[PDB]
Design an enzyme around this catalytic site. Structure first.
Site, PDB file in Angstrom:
ATOM      1  N   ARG A   1       0.823  -1.203   0.000  1.00 53.39           N
ATOM      2  CA  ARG A   1       0.000   0.000   0.000  1.00 53.39           C
ATOM      3  C   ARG A   1       0.861   1.258   0.000  1.00 53.39           C
ATOM      4  O   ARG A   1       0.386   2.326   0.392  1.00 53.39           O
ATOM      5  CB  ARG A   1      -0.966   0.007   1.189  1.00 53.39           C
ATOM      6  CG  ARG A   1      -0.287   0.042   2.519  1.00 53.39           C
ATOM      7  CD  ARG A   1      -1.155   0.732   3.566  1.00 53.39           C
ATOM      8  NE  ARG A   1      -1.408   2.122   3.218  1.00 53.39           N
ATOM      9  CZ  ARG A   1      -2.423   2.838   3.677  1.00 53.39           C
ATOM     10  NH1 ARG A   1      -3.280   2.338   4.541  1.00 53.39           N
ATOM     11  NH2 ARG A   1      -2.589   4.083   3.239  1.00 53.39           N
TER      12      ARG A   1
ATOM     13  N   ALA B   1      -1.084  12.845   8.522  1.00 55.52           N
ATOM     14  CA  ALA B   1      -0.335  11.853   7.765  1.00 55.52           C
ATOM     15  C   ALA B   1      -0.802  11.833   6.321  1.00 55.52           C
ATOM     16  O   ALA B   1      -1.918  12.255   6.002  1.00 55.52           O
ATOM     17  CB  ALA B   1      -0.529  10.465   8.372  1.00 55.52           C
TER      18      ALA B   1
ATOM     19  N   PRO C   1       5.489  -5.830   9.835  1.00 58.71           N
ATOM     20  CA  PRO C   1       6.263  -6.384   8.721  1.00 58.71           C
ATOM     21  C   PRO C   1       6.092  -7.872   8.494  1.00 58.71           C
ATOM     22  O   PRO C   1       6.650  -8.369   7.522  1.00 58.71           O
ATOM     23  CB  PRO C   1       7.708  -6.009   9.083  1.00 58.71           C
ATOM     24  CG  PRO C   1       7.698  -5.902  10.586  1.00 58.71           C
ATOM     25  CD  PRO C   1       6.351  -5.307  10.914  1.00 58.71           C
ATOM     26  N   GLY C   2       5.341  -8.601   9.314  1.00 55.51           N
ATOM     27  CA  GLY C   2       5.010  -9.961   8.979  1.00 55.51           C
ATOM     28  C   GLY C   2       4.059 -10.070   7.813  1.00 55.51           C
ATOM     29  O   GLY C   2       4.024 -11.112   7.180  1.00 55.51           O
TER      30      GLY C   2
ATOM     31  N   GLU D   1     -15.747  16.009   0.075  1.00 59.06           N
ATOM     32  CA  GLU D   1     -15.515  14.744  -0.621  1.00 59.06           C
ATOM     33  C   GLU D   1     -15.537  13.579   0.381  1.00 59.06           C
ATOM     34  O   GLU D   1     -16.409  13.519   1.249  1.00 59.06           O
ATOM     35  CB  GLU D   1     -14.192  14.793  -1.392  1.00 59.06           C
TER      36      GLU D   1
HETATM   37  N1  LIG Z   1      -8.095   1.518   2.634  1.00 55.95           N
HETATM   38  C1  LIG Z   1      -8.395   2.126   1.484  1.00 55.95           C
HETATM   39  N2  LIG Z   1      -9.110   1.552   0.507  1.00 55.95           N
HETATM   40  C2  LIG Z   1      -9.399   2.213  -0.632  1.00 55.95           C
HETATM   41  N3  LIG Z   1      -8.977   3.476  -0.871  1.00 55.95           N
HETATM   42  C3  LIG Z   1      -8.230   4.144   0.036  1.00 55.95           C
HETATM   43  C4  LIG Z   1      -7.909   3.486   1.290  1.00 55.95           C
HETATM   44  N4  LIG Z   1      -7.165   4.328   2.030  1.00 55.95           N
HETATM   45  C5  LIG Z   1      -7.028   5.463   1.309  1.00 55.95           C
HETATM   46  N5  LIG Z   1      -7.662   5.349   0.121  1.00 55.95           N
HETATM   47  C6  LIG Z   1      -7.762   6.398  -0.925  1.00 55.95           C
HETATM   48  O1  LIG Z   1      -6.754   7.384  -0.697  1.00 55.95           O
HETATM   49  C7  LIG Z   1      -7.364   8.644  -0.368  1.00 55.95           C
HETATM   50  C8  LIG Z   1      -6.572   9.413   0.675  1.00 55.95           C
HETATM   51  O2  LIG Z   1      -6.363   8.589   1.815  1.00 55.95           O
HETATM   52  P1  LIG Z   1      -6.660   9.113   3.305  1.00 55.95           P
HETATM   53  O3  LIG Z   1      -6.775  10.624   3.291  1.00 55.95           O
HETATM   54  O4  LIG Z   1      -5.656   8.456   4.224  1.00 55.95           O
HETATM   55  O5  LIG Z   1      -8.113   8.430   3.535  1.00 55.95           O
HETATM   56  P2  LIG Z   1      -9.468   9.165   4.058  1.00 55.95           P
HETATM   57  O6  LIG Z   1     -10.009   9.899   2.847  1.00 55.95           O
HETATM   58  O7  LIG Z   1     -10.340   8.016   4.521  1.00 55.95           O
HETATM   59  O8  LIG Z   1      -9.002  10.065   5.181  1.00 55.95           O
HETATM   60  C9  LIG Z   1      -8.780   8.303   0.095  1.00 55.95           C
HETATM   61  O9  LIG Z   1      -9.715   9.354  -0.104  1.00 55.95           O
HETATM   62  C10 LIG Z   1      -9.107   7.098  -0.765  1.00 55.95           C
HETATM   63  O10 LIG Z   1      -9.612   7.527  -2.030  1.00 55.95           O
HETATM   64  N1  LIG Z   2       2.913 -13.051   5.215  1.00 57.91           N
HETATM   65  C1  LIG Z   2       2.609 -14.371   5.249  1.00 57.91           C
HETATM   66  N2  LIG Z   2       2.175 -15.068   4.166  1.00 57.91           N
HETATM   67  C2  LIG Z   2       1.907 -16.385   4.233  1.00 57.91           C
HETATM   68  N3  LIG Z   2       2.049 -17.125   5.361  1.00 57.91           N
HETATM   69  C3  LIG Z   2       2.478 -16.545   6.510  1.00 57.91           C
HETATM   70  C4  LIG Z   2       2.791 -15.113   6.501  1.00 57.91           C
HETATM   71  N4  LIG Z   2       3.182 -14.786   7.752  1.00 57.91           N
HETATM   72  C5  LIG Z   2       3.136 -15.919   8.500  1.00 57.91           C
HETATM   73  N5  LIG Z   2       2.708 -16.966   7.760  1.00 57.91           N
HETATM   74  C6  LIG Z   2       2.546 -18.360   8.243  1.00 57.91           C
HETATM   75  O1  LIG Z   2       2.373 -18.379   9.665  1.00 57.91           O
HETATM   76  C7  LIG Z   2       3.429 -19.138  10.272  1.00 57.91           C
HETATM   77  C8  LIG Z   2       3.851 -18.525  11.592  1.00 57.91           C
HETATM   78  O2  LIG Z   2       4.005 -17.123  11.406  1.00 57.91           O
HETATM   79  P1  LIG Z   2       5.283 -16.347  11.996  1.00 57.91           P
HETATM   80  O3  LIG Z   2       6.400 -16.444  10.977  1.00 57.91           O
HETATM   81  O4  LIG Z   2       5.500 -16.842  13.409  1.00 57.91           O
HETATM   82  O5  LIG Z   2       4.730 -14.828  12.032  1.00 57.91           O
HETATM   83  P2  LIG Z   2       3.632 -14.330  13.108  1.00 57.91           P
HETATM   84  O6  LIG Z   2       4.045 -14.987  14.406  1.00 57.91           O
HETATM   85  O7  LIG Z   2       3.773 -12.822  13.111  1.00 57.91           O
HETATM   86  O8  LIG Z   2       2.313 -14.821  12.552  1.00 57.91           O
HETATM   87  C9  LIG Z   2       4.571 -19.152   9.259  1.00 57.91           C
HETATM   88  O9  LIG Z   2       5.417 -20.291   9.381  1.00 57.91           O
HETATM   89  C10 LIG Z   2       3.830 -19.123   7.935  1.00 57.91           C
HETATM   90  O10 LIG Z   2       3.529 -20.451   7.506  1.00 57.91           O
END
Ligand SMILES: Nc1ncnc2c1ncn2[C@@H]1O[C@H](COP(=O)(O)OP(=O)(O)O)[C@@H](O)[C@H]1O
Ligand SMILES: Nc1ncnc2c1ncn2[C@@H]1O[C@H](COP(=O)(O)OP(=O)(O)O)[C@@H](O)[C@H]1O
Lengths: 202, 198
Positions: A50, A90, A128-129, A154
């Site tokens: 994203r 943000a 970051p997982g 909007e």
């Molecule tokens: N989770 C989401 N799914 C779809 N579109 C998104 C999402 N987050 C942000 N956007 C798009 O990016 C624009 C700017 O994002 P932001 O200002 O953070 O959201 P919001 O308008 O809800 O405050 C939003 O108006 C929307 O069009």
């Molecule tokens: N991003 C991902 N995509 C697919 N499978 C995942 C992902 N993250 C975790 N898994 C599955 O979950 C199991 C355990 O997750 P782990 O690596 O301990 O991360 P967390 O504890 O944050 O879930 C992994 O061995 C993997 O099989």
């Protein structure tokens, strides 16, 4: 001390888009070194893509006040008392933009604020997982007496709230502010406000 | 004071799962009250849905040490020096499980640590513009001299609290769960050490 392996120790073989929409979900396929001395097999992981964000903590060092913005975040609904959250200014960082340029634009659009001096707080990975998202936080000098009212475009509706620093931090402790960007920024402020106020009120 | 509107002020019209694999990509369609009065039009948002997590900061109050776990997180690759990160113990909360039960189990599984007392830190939304994920952090009492080894491929590190916090300041620890937990620890460790070393 510190981490064990570098980018020399991992190969991303391919990425496959699983979902292509406003955001995307990608499958990364990769191999990497193991702590026991070997190499992994091919691993796949789903990663929410994203883009990345700039975050601004608007702090008035003269008044010792923090500006918060309130807006709905529907993703909060299932686990929160209300989907309206109290947050930091943000915005997403587009190609070629700086963190500061985004922070200043969003401070005006979301809170009606001009920003003076700025300093980095921290840049962090949200989760970051499962997502690549990085958010880079700055503290920005503001005149909190100018922070008020309803902003946003909007699809965007944002209410400004001004609190003292101590009040904002109490809201963190109590769970009234409970989103990562704001928690990180306000904890940082509690750890650094004395020096920051000295620097900005010389 | 505080927030203005409640769940009575938003109508979720529809939810759809657009992708389901290991995680889900959901679409929410909704309308909501506006601060100046009235209701918005219909809004659609994509939401990354992966459930919710328990997190444990392993702290040794005798030694003023924290136990960190190292493992690759490929999502970090594009914006980080290395995808191997230093992190808190953590895991998904399954149905009817408590945060504490998950935290204590993951400490054993990921770091080989028995946990004594626990206290809540904070529960936070990782990135609520695009993901529903909530993570609930506890601090857990450990004997850091028992932490070692390889434990999914995970290496256990023991460092002083002061070093872990300096690594946050330096950007060497830069994942939300660890930053939040270690900043909390920096604010609270003196009282916590007194409480746990009676
Ligand atoms: N989770 C989401 N799914 C779809 N579109 C998104 C999402 N987050 C942000 N956007 C798009 O990016 C624009 C700017 O994002 P932001 O200002 O953070 O959201 P919001 O308008 O809800 O405050 C939003 O108006 C929307 O069009
Ligand atoms: N991003 C991902 N995509 C697919 N499978 C995942 C992902 N993250 C975790 N898994 C599955 O979950 C199991 C355990 O997750 P782990 O690596 O301990 O991360 P967390 O504890 O944050 O879930 C992994 O061995 C993997 O099989």
């Amino acid at each position: 001390q510190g981490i064990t392996f570098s980018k020399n120790d991992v190969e991303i073989i391919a990425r496959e888009t699983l979902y292509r929409g406003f955001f995307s979900l990608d499958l990364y396929r990769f191999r990497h070194r193991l702590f026991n001395g070997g190499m992994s097999g091919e691993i796949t992981r789903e990663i929410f893509e994203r883009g990345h964000a700039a975050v601004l903590l608007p702090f008035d060092p003269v008044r010792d006040e923090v500006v918060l913005v309130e807006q709905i975040r529907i993703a909060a609904y299932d686990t929160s008392e209300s989907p309206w959250l109290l947050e930091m200014v943000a915005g997403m960082i587009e190609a070629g933009e700086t963190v500061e340029d985004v922070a200043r634009r969003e401070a005006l659009e979301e809170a009606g604020l001009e920003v003076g001096r700025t300093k980095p707080i921290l840049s962090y990975l949200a989760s970051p997982g499962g997502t690549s998202e990085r958010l880079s936080i700055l503290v920005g000098e503001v005149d909190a007496s100018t922070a008020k009212g309803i902003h946003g475009l909007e699809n965007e509706d944002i209410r400004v709230h001004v609190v003292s620093r101590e009040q904002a931090y109490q809201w963190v402790e109590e769970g009234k502010i409970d989103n990562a960007a704001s928690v990180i920024a306000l904890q940082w402020l509690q750890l650094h406000y004395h020096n920051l106020r000295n620097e900005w009120t010389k």
